[PDB]
mmCIF file of C-alpha atoms in Angstrom:
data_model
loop_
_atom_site.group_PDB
_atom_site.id
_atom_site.type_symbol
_atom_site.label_atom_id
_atom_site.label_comp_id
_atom_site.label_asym_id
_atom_site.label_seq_id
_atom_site.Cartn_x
_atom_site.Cartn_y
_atom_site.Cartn_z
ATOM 1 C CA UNK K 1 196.583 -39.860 -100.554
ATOM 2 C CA UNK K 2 197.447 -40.806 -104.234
ATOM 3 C CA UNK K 3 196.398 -37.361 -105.805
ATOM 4 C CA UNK K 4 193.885 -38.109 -108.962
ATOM 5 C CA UNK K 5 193.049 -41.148 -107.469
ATOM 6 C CA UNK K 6 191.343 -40.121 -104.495
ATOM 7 C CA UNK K 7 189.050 -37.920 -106.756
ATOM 8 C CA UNK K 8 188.527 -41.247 -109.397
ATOM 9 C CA UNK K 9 187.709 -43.268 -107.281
ATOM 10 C CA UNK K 10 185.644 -41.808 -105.367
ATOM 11 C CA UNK K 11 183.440 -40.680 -108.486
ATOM 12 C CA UNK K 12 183.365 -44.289 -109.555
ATOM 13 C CA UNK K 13 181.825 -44.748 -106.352
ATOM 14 C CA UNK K 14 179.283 -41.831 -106.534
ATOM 15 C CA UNK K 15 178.011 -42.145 -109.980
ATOM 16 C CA UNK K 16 178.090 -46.424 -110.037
ATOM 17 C CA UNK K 17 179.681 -45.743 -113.512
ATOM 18 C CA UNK K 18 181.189 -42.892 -115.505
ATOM 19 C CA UNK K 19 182.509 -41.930 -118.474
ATOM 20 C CA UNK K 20 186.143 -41.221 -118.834
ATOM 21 C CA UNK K 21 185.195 -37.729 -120.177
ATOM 22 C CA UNK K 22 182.728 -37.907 -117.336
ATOM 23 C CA UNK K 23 185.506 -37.747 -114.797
ATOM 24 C CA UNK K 24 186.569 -35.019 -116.734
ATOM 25 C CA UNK K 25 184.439 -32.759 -115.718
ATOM 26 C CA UNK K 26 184.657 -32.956 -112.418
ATOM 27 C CA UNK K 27 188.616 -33.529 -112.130
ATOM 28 C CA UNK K 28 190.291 -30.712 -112.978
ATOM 29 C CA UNK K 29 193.618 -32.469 -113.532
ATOM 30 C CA UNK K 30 194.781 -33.515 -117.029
ATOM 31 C CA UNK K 31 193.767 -36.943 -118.550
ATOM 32 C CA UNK K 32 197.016 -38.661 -118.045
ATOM 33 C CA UNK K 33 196.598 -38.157 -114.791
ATOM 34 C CA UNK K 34 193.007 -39.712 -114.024
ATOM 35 C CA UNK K 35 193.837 -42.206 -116.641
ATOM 36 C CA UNK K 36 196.307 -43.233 -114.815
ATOM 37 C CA UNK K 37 195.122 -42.851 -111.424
ATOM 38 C CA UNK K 38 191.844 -45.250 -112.822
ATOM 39 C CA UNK K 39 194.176 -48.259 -114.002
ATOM 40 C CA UNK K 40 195.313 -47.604 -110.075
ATOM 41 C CA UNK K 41 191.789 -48.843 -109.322
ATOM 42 C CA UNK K 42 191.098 -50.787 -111.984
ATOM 43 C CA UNK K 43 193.809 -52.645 -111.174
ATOM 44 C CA UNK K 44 192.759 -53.043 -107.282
ATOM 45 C CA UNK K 45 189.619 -54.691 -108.631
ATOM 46 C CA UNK K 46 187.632 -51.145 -107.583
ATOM 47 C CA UNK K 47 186.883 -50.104 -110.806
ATOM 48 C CA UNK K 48 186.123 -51.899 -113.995
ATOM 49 C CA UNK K 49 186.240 -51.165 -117.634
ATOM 50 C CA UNK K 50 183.048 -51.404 -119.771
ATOM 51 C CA UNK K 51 183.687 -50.180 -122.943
ATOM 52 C CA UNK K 52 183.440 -46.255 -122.801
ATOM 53 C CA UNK K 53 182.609 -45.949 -119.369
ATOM 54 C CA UNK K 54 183.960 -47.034 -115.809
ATOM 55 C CA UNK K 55 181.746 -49.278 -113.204
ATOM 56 C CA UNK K 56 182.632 -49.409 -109.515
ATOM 57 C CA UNK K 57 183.266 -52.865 -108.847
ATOM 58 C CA UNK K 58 180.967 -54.787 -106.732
ATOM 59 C CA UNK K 59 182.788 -55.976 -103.385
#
């Protein structure tokens, strides 16, 4: 239960890969937050960075 991150992640997951303004739009919390909350993931090898969008991480 880590607050944005539930919601980013789980995007990541849905969508394969999104935007950062992508997430956005569906989380309703401020950018800092999800930005945040994504280096969280990122970090965890769930997520990766690809420029200007976000790819769920093959496992």
């Amino acid at each position: 239960m880590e607050d944005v991150k539930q919601s980013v992640e789980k995007i990541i997951k849905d969508r394969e890969w999104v935007t950062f303004n992508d997430l956005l739009k569906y989380i309703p919390y401020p950018a800092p937050e999800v930005y945040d909350a994504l280096s969280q993931l990122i970090k965890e090898n769930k997520v990766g960075r690809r420029g200007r969008y976000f790819y769920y991480i093959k496992r």
